[PDB]
Amino acid sequence: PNEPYLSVIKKVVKLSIPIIVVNLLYTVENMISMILVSSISPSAVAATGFSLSLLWFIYSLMALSYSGTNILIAQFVGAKKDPSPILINGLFLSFLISLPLFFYGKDFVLFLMKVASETVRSLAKEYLTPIFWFIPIGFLTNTFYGAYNGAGDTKTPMKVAIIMNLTHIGTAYTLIVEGAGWGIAISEILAFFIYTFLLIFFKKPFPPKLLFKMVRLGTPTALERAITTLSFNVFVGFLAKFGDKVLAAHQIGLRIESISFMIGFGVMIASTTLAGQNYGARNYRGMVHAVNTSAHFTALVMSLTGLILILFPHYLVYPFSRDPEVIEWASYYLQIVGISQPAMAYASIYSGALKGMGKTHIPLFVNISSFWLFRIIPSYFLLKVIHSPLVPWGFMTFETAVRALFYYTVFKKVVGKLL
Amino acid sequence: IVNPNEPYLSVIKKVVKLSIPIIVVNLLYTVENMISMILVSSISPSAVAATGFSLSLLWFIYSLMALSYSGTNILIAQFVGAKKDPSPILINGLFLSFLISLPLFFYGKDFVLFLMKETVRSLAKEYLTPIFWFIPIGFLTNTFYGAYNGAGDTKTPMKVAIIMNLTHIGTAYTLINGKFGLPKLGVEGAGWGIAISEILAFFIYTFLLIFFKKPFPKLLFKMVRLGTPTALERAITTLSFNVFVGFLAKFGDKVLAAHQIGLRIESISFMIGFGVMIASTTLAGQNYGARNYRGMVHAVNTSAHFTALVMSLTGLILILFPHYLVYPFSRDPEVIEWASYYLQIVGISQPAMAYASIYSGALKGMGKTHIPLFVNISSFWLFRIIPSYFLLPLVPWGFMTFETAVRALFYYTVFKKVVGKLL
């Protein structure tokens, strides 16, 4: 409402560091899994990495189960209303939409893999056979992880994520390509049963025809994620035309940015929860200042981090790559993407804040509508003059800025009609 | 346009007066595609296969075509209904298709070859080179369509469709063969024959709005937010219906022939509902903006049951005489028995395809355009694709029927709970 800086960032950080921890644990989990399957064969690593980096399209439709619950429970707890009929319907919706992935889901993935090699797909079949048996289990765990975030108790998914990733890595270590998928499956079932023992017993998540609501709210994000993975695939294929050495540096820049993506996504889910609990309580002038201060602080954090990127180029990639004409490209990458990290703070906060406010159809109209018009398209037009990979990266950096002043200038006007 | 107490006959005469031009646009297109298939069938078998899979693929490519249509079909309906000036909507709807069709221009011709997984592909190349050349013109023409059925004037797109179809004889029959001494374009002829047909309609279409001021003389985010869910409804259902045809694909070509000919015999007795659906969209839009909610309900309630009677007669014809409808298209007997057993399963659902179509169009007029997205999708899996998976050729078809019958009682209750709370 009008509580000062320290007060609002205390209520933020204590519920945003847990999501940062969860996402960084996911990063560590997948890196250690890459290392675990690296001790098999380059073909096994190819299969595993391609099948994992391809699920961001299947493992991307659960934005219904996640968002349709996260958005509603925030406004319901904010308004002090019983947020019980959403957990039941949230779990029912997750289990309902996870079924078309149980059956014709892995076959869809094999179909997409055909469009690589043939042995790689046959090994990916072994890797995905146990994963798809417990896909509704993963949908339920995701609905839980999206419901605890709405009630303002992210420490519980933090603890459960520590448990789940430890179990994942341990079971994969024991069984190790099929055991690597058994790791995911067993981790998901264990985290799900832990959530169940926490739920019905000590009602810690919480103690019926809003399927319209959560469907209509989660469908836009379910779009955004998949239609962004495809778009970024086009943008990545842009770099494939000129050389394969520069091509493999974007896969390192992925992890370099991954920590900041995880931090911003944590402070995005947190700002989502905050904006939702203020909008539901009919406390709009509260969420204005709340997201304002959260953005002002996360922008300083991101300034510091993206400045680390600029000031320490090679001295973050030495363990990764150690050869000429590589440190140059990853370095120029970081130095170019260093500037556009505060903008990622603003574009994460404001977009996640509208999500909590209910404007879930806005992100795909600021992410997809930005993207092309300012990056990809202008580098798919200029790139016939300058034949160097600095064009897509510099345009990336400029476009994250103009996207960051999309969100800001579409936030001000949305709250105007509210007052 | 219809008041809350017109005696049914009064509107039943004023809905079949308006729906018939839409029915003639939907028909004659059937003849266009039939005659084009035959003309291409006059040459190579690979040409037949390539053209068939192209038109069945250009169904999906055209799913990004409703965004300009649904954006201008619905809006104008309300704008004309609420006696508000709908001209800027017209220009911002025409300029939208063009602007949004160049993504299909340039990188979009090889996209088809990409998705089509040898001579067959090369024949698709000499086919998808001149059509995509004038594809913005076709998008604009479909937007002109949309505008005309929205404003309530469907007879003009009827005449335009007639003249375009007549442009598919000559600029086709000739350009394929070569009576005019012109070189045999081969399959490419069937390309130009489509492309050229748009140009003609463009003239007539771009003529009336200047010379005769058509019927009449920012914020397109509205139009885009309306058109995107319809594009999803027509882009995801195509995909996911192929996941249902995989069910029947497990019995050989003799059942694929049954389903493929069912598509045809169906289509013949399909345009009725799609025409009345566009008409009911227009009616519900023109009454929603005019605050005539009771009259809107009365119109949709009367037209739904009238179309139910018509489709009951139609399904009865399909059930009583299936053998004679398949005799034109099949000589292998087992195919005959499968197609007859199929039409007896569809003809039942025919009356239930009137309520679905009418209520589907009706909720489009009154903004709510995400309804048919999560109504026609959450029904596939839940009722036709899964309950057929757990019981496995009459199981999948008999569940198709009752799915598009439970889609009736689902479209309705939503419609009634939405429209009773309008009052």
Side-chain angles (χ1 to χ4, degrees), chain A residues 175-198:
Chain A
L175 270 63
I176 284 298
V177 66
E178 180 182 351
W182 282 115
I184 299 183
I186 296 179
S187 65
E188 287 189 349
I189 73 155
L190 178 103
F192 168 67
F193 273 107
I194 284 185
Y195 272 146
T196 295
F197 178 80
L198 296 187

Side-chain angles (χ1 to χ4, degrees), chain B residues 208-222:
Chain B
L208 279 313
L209 84 177
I210 308 204
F211 265 54
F212 303 61
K213 281 169 201 167
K214 199 192 39 88
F216 34 61
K218 344 282 191 63
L219 178 33
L220 294 50
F221 198 44
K222 189 62 176 177

Side-chain angles (χ1 to χ4, degrees), chain B residues 173-349:
Chain B
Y173 166 85
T174 302
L175 259 53
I176 296 279
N177 293 112
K179 182 183 61 179
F180 262 68
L182 292 176
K184 315 198 174 184
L185 306 183
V187 48
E188 185 191 12
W192 283 100
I194 296 183
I196 278 194
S197 45
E198 319 180 312
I199 291 114
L200 206 56
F202 201 46
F203 296 156
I204 277 44
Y205 268 132
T206 326
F207 204 28
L208 279 313
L209 84 177
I210 308 204
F211 265 54
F212 303 61
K213 281 169 201 167
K214 199 192 39 88
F216 34 61
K218 344 282 191 63
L219 178 33
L220 294 50
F221 198 44
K222 189 62 176 177
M223 293 198 207
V224 188
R225 202 237 171 179
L226 272 79
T228 296
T230 64
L232 297 199
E233 176 261 343
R234 283 188 179 179
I236 284 62
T237 36
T238 290
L239 260 78
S240 61
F241 147 63
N242 290 120
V243 160
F244 164 93
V245 86
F247 275 59
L248 278 309
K250 267 64 169 296
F251 282 100
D253 296 331
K254 299 304 170 168
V255 172
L256 294 186
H259 214 82
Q260 203 168 348
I261 296 176
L263 170 71
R264 187 75 34 79
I265 299 181
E266 274 326 280
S267 100
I268 281 172
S269 55
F270 279 26
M271 291 43 248
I272 318 274
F274 180 41
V276 181
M277 166 183 178
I278 302 187
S280 176
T281 308
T282 294
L283 293 177
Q286 293 186 358
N287 294 13
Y288 184 86
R291 213 83 51 169
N292 198 251
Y293 296 157
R294 302 187 131 279
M296 186 180 70
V297 182
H298 190 59
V300 301
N301 184 30
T302 300
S303 61
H305 291 88
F306 166 77
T307 316
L309 291 172
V310 160
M311 294 272 85
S312 299
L313 171 63
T314 301
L316 188 66
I317 297 179
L318 262 66
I319 290 173
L320 290 184
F321 309 88
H323 284 312
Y324 317 113
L325 271 67
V326 199
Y327 191 97
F329 301 156
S330 99
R331 294 327 197 289
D332 203 14
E334 330 211 321
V335 172
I336 291 184
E337 86 172 304
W338 276 137
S340 296
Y341 263 120
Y342 175 52
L343 298 169
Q344 282 135 260
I345 302 280
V346 166
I348 284 170
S349 58

